[PDB]
């Protein structure tokens, strides 16, 4: 049988020739029995003085923690990232120090929509989270499997998710809400084209690219800075499932992703991604036609060639799923000195948003869990006593700054980068930004005829459930994209209507 099917047997194979341990309570008390409760005779009530039953049950009651607000489903792995090119001219970060550096990494694949226990094979953006344990602490690159996103305003992310998830009264999936929100916000027409294309349903998790999709800013040792995007493309080649094959797999194995990834890791065919960077200088950022920090826009390849940096390989399965996938925390705020944030609105939103949900779900001291703890660095600061602190709490060191008792002092070299902006502070409306150029280029340059047919078929198949006027608004936006696009969509609609 497959490794995922012969897991516990392998455990018995590894733990041969050693005697089985003694079943004890949480507090090391060895127990008499765990196959019967204390009673008053054979047909009598229970006694409170049966402590083992009470302890076991009271710990069993609290086995669940709040699922993530988004990307609930998940499959994780561990590996090491390796450098192959010099980019020290761009960054000071110890992750790009020299050639031949092994940095431990954790990775997690997720589905933005599906809750804990849904069928994985569904038309939804896949999430690709990477965490590097750099010598200067952690770095979290939280990417999507698409180079863009539905919206460009952070204040709309809650509503968006509310539309993508179940109904408030019926508690069902409703295409009505999804298509209403999509038609009202035209800035999404691009991402929709990506979502309903052939690359919408990837082959498990080893056959899909991953994109940073955020305009980061690198600073060199000299203090100069350039804007950049991170990419990483698969070495196993892009592979995607037909709608019928995904439909069959959603019934056969609802968790095909986790099974495939685990079988591949236990088999020895180590999956690998190649790491690329797009670089842009400040003058180019000033002379770019669109807004160079808009999340819905991409950078054309011709004007911005890719630059190889390194590769990712995953060579370890999680010893336990819960402690290494359910309890892992990715903060886009964890950026080492050498990688800064930009004026990109969505990145600014995420910097504040992520740690709050991490404190709610895991616990106020989530940074002390061994999967999150930065063991390749040293933690020393003026954070103190919180709920469930598993460390020594840094002993009796002074806990106020500044002081005069030789306490930890700031590093003057890790200062941030400064750049001047001009204009009033107010609310700017961005609903008037371009939405039709890049999607048109994607339509008439990237796709062939058969893939256009499949795309229109998928969109019509998912859109046939909406109301009449939402359908009219959607097809109006699509004919705004291109006449052929809208005409095909509308034709298949009246075929379904």
């Amino acid at each position: 049988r497959d490794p995922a099917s012969d897991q516990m047997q392998h455990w018995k194979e590894q733990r041969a020739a050693q005697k089985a341990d003694v079943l004890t309570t949480g507090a090391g008390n060895p127990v008499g029995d765990k196959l019967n409760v204390i009673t008053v005779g054979p047909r009598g009530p229970l006694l409170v003085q049966d402590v083992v039953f009470t302890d076991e049950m009271a710990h069993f009651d609290r086995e669940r923690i709040p699922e993530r607000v988004v990307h609930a489903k998940g499959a994780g792995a561990f590996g090491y990232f390796e450098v192959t090119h010099d980019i020290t001219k761009y960054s000071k970060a110890k992750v790009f120090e020299h050639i031949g550096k092994k940095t431990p990494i954790a990775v997690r694949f997720s589905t933005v929509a599906g809750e804990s226990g849904s069928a994985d094979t569904v038309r939804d953006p896949r999430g690709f989270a990477v965490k590097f344990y750099t010598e200067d602490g952690n770095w979290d690159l939280v990417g999507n499997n698409t180079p863009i996103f539905f919206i460009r305003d952070p204040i709309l992310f809650p509503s968006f998710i509310h539309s993508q998830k179940r109904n408030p009264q019926t508690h069902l999936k409703d295409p009505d809400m999804v298509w209403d929100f999509w038609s009202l916000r035209p800035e999404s027409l691009h991402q929709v084209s990506f979502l309903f294309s052939d690359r919408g349903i990837p082959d498990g998790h080893r056959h899909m690219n991953g994109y940073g999709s955020h305009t980061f800013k690198l600073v060199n040792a000299n203090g100069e800075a350039v804007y950049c995007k991170f990419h990483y493309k698969t070495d196993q080649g892009i592979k995607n499932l037909s709608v019928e094959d995904a439909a069959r797999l959603s019934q056969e194995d609802p968790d095909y992703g986790i099974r495939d990834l685990f079988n591949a890791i236990a088999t020895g065919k180590y999956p690998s991604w190649t790491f690329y960077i797009q670089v842009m200088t400040f003058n180019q950022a000033e002379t770019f036609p669109f807004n160079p920090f808009d999340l819905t826009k991409v950078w054309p390849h011709k004007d911005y060639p890719l630059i190889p940096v390194g590769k990712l390989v995953l060579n370890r399965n999680p010893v336990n799923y819960f402690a290494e996938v359910e309890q892992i925390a990715f903060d886009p705020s964890n950026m080492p000195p050498g990688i800064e944030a930009s004026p990109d609105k969505m990145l600014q939103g995420r910097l504040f948003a992520y740690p709050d949900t991490h404190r709610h779900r895991l616990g106020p001291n989530y940074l002390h869990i061994p999967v999150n703890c930065p063991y390749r660095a040293r933690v020393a600061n003026y954070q103190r006593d919180g709920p469930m602190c598993m460390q020594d709490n840094q002993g009796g060191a002074p806990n106020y700054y500044p002081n005069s008792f030789g306490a930890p002092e700031q590093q003057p070299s890790a200062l941030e980068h400064s750049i001047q902006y001009s204009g009033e502070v107010r609310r700017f409306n961005t609903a008037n930004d371009d939405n039709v150029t890049q999607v048109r280029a994607f339509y008439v340059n990237v796709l062939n005829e058969e893939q256009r047919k499949r795309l229109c078929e998928n969109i019509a198949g998912h859109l046939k459930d909406a109301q009449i006027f939402i359908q009219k608004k959607a097809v109006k936006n699509f004919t705004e994209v291109h006449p052929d696009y809208g005409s095909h969509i509308q034709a298949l609609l009246d075929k379904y209507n």
Copy 2:
């Protein structure tokens, strides 16, 4: 379209001719805009003084609460229970006071295994929770769709669930663990026969019976007591899905149950259950062949006729799903004066187990949520300040008992019932109890030939994934049940092997 598909439209239909309200923050502050964040110019970073974005995001982060440890999936409804017979000779409870009493009820259907978001149509015991708002507070009847259960010892319930759920390392469903636990505990051979029979997959939720399955004890006004079981059978007739139809529906609509129940409630075809009681006197309990409080045994119909009491009808959908299904709490401990607990070990376990998980998941003051609050009675006790108390905290009344300031005093009439037991207090082993008689009667009396064929087919189809020696132990237990049973199972096994 169907009501579940035309929900929000109906809302717009109900709220016609009234102007749309003003979008405000949590604290009633009317907002300027919710379509853009404060920036420093058009391409500048965000400001902290954008309070609305911070508030919205920080509330969006905490939208998830820990899912139930079991029975995560759910569909709820509201109705009223109505009496049609006099059982005042048996109970003092105000729910059975007289003929013509309308008691408000909440009901919830669930699946013991499937987490939040799985396909509903699966071979697993369905849970049937009812809550009566009796004039003397709440009463929670937490039943199964089968008259029995897998085990008879409460200390084994955690392990059982751990076997029924995902693997700890691979995080997949493993038939290995399930069948190992089932073969090691022969007391389950009965329930398995129920689970893998034709009634294992019911038709939505309106086509399945519900059973209390616990030996309760009723006490009259005179103080005399009799043991009893509660039943309630559907008026729409038993209906079940073929394995192929359930397989297709698990892909088409993963939430067929909620959809069907909601469409039926909104259509007007009010589903109804008939309420029956089995009664037994103390002498009968002393002269019963098996243990009359064993959870794996049933009471033969001939010796114990059914007694009609009333009917349940569901005539209201939840106004909001989360506040009326996600936040409802059923405690088998909430039993009004007139319905007592018995020496049944599993009922004793549940009495302590349920409130603990309810305090963990919802909150220490979960009894103040309008869906749980006993509005048909008066709450007055010496419970005080806790986290998030939404009530007046009963004002400045004395908070200690006893006192001399005319505070709430105990009701001397609601005393419990007392009965003497003989024998030492110790651990009794119950693994030597009968496991083969009732299952044999179920096999050779209840079933026809075709249903036997289907049962053996289903068991073999689910068991073909286990190891060799677990298969040998399972077929050994089955041949212990009956030779034909085991022979058919083994034949289909070597066909699959």
Copy 3:
């Protein structure tokens, strides 16, 4: 006896001629007894089936919620705020709409240092929190009893509190940490003069002024804006305790504040504060000598006359202490359209800081507690399901924005005010700002000789416990203030040394 001593008797006096209620469980089940547990005979163990004991104990275990990080001790009251002057030329807020408006208010007095249960009469800044239930939601004015504060940088507030509180290893109060932090940050020399003056220990809570101390910004109906400060001064006259009287009261009645305030409210002598505003125009803000938004600076009275607005009166005691003082939440972010935040760094910090601790301590839905709920307005937004939501969750309304189902839409009139700033975005150092002018004016103009003697005595009495070199640095800062000041401090020091 005094009302605070004859509280519960009065309850018995109010509830005369009505029969005592029935003691019930949380779920309305009337109980048999609450003076003995179920046992197996007279000298036997307990039974689990004693549900009432389990429920009572399990609710008693969770009676504590995390105390506030600061201002733990507290005494609260309720009243109404009344207007007496027209300031509509300055603000649009419905709280200053016209003359003769009654706005319900809640107020709370606290001590920044002392934990829950310490002696109130101590040398520490007193906190004065007011909450108006304006027709456009809540407004929280969270003031101090001094017009200034120790620091001017928000990032230093944690360290500051850590110094003011107990030692990490010994868990005692240490003057060493306090005086080290004070000497290292000279910007505090002003507030210290206020803290160790005669007005440091007020007479209970009805004999102290209260100051907004934050530079707010008002906007009129025309859209023009002016900077302002809020003041409110007592009508009972400033009264302060001698160090010996406060020392005696700290032993006699550790809670003198709560007792005095409650006795005064129950006696009928309704305490009252007069509400004043300081106003400044943008040109004045540009031509001000110091930084007009510095928290350590005041505005000289001569150049900025006070403007009366209204008065506060407290005419109601809390019906229950816990539900009306322990569970009240003041957010400086709750500012109605008409009162904006300024570039004041500390106000910006507080806007983000307060709601986070409020979500941690109370609960994610703390805005649903009747003491915090804005009942004088209407809540309608796209916030949804959270832990322990006591409301109807706004029923089955659409939960995404924008939509096309006549949902709540933004109010275009409540837009914020915009003003341009020039200069790079970076870290500015403020440790070089003036610290000696206003403190010198306070010393040689405000105080007489005897009060100077008392101030120097108090500072020396509290400073005699520090190390030698911390003493040298403190007296160096004081001689930087003025030679006589430092010389007196040093003289009394060598007297104590």
Copy 4:
């Protein structure tokens, strides 16, 4: 200066000749500065992209955990317990295995009434918690400084505490509630005599005895059992403060206990307690005049001589207060094989009560904190994933019992002890038990005349604040004790009245 005054200096003395560390964020990111926030120019608002401020503030907000429901104030120490006599004839426990065994121990002193931050020197029972890290897991002996307690029924403990704590409406201490509850429950007259005697206020914490006060049961290797009580008496001699000295110290140093204990531990005068056992055989338990398991009764010394076992010495201060005193959990349920619970009602209540509050306050996985973790044993069981699990979660081992993959199996030798009880299961009333004999013996045998005078003075001084009829009921109970007692109390009363 004293060690408690020269703590942090000593740290600087220990960390001489090493360079100060680098101040980093929780996630190892070294920081630029912590003395100023990011602004838009010198007088501009803050930016969200200042991550360090957000992280620091959000962690500072959650620095508080719910204080214990009782015994909030505390002072802790660490040491080792050493055996000096053979009691293997009585117990099998590895703590009493042989002579010369060093078992690590943690100890904590507390005050049952005073909240976190009150003056320690007050008339209230002191709590003495000891935790042994035995080779077979932890053992928690949670004793009082008196051999008795106020009540004998667990269901009354909440009400009792509610009376001892602050008023619900006024939030003050009220002698009315305390004396009403004491007069209504005469079973307390004994403990009151102990509480208001000279030994009510001990000299710090090194000058008071400690008593198990619970009737435990020991079982030998042979399986025979005997009832027992644990005692431990100080080697520094009983020392107590006069009411005037305690009054002065409550103003001078509110935390005299922690200061004294820490100074003594850092000075080298290692405090020591001598460990004694009272033993009783089953026949003696059957022929005892009173109820031998009543919490309000003691065992006369003459009939039951003390048996020395070992001594406790404290030779280590807590490295950090919070992680070693605020986060320590004592469960009277943690009893190694060899020390059992008895039919004592209060011990049965505590066995269930303690772990629930421990799960609420600390966290569902509180047994993983290094101060609570049983490092002298091995934990291996079927408890799994919970909130904030800091361990490896025992890797991919099977998580269900029983199984067939060589998993941890129960220890058949650690079985519990069984004994038969006779009589019905019901509610027995114990308010008719003797309350006057032992208190009379304590009065006329243990005390001299001067101590009687002091006792009556203290009781009158605390009782002068109650109502008239509560005073009459109290003096009636006291004259029930003895005529002279009541007459003295009443005389001093009319002197105060």
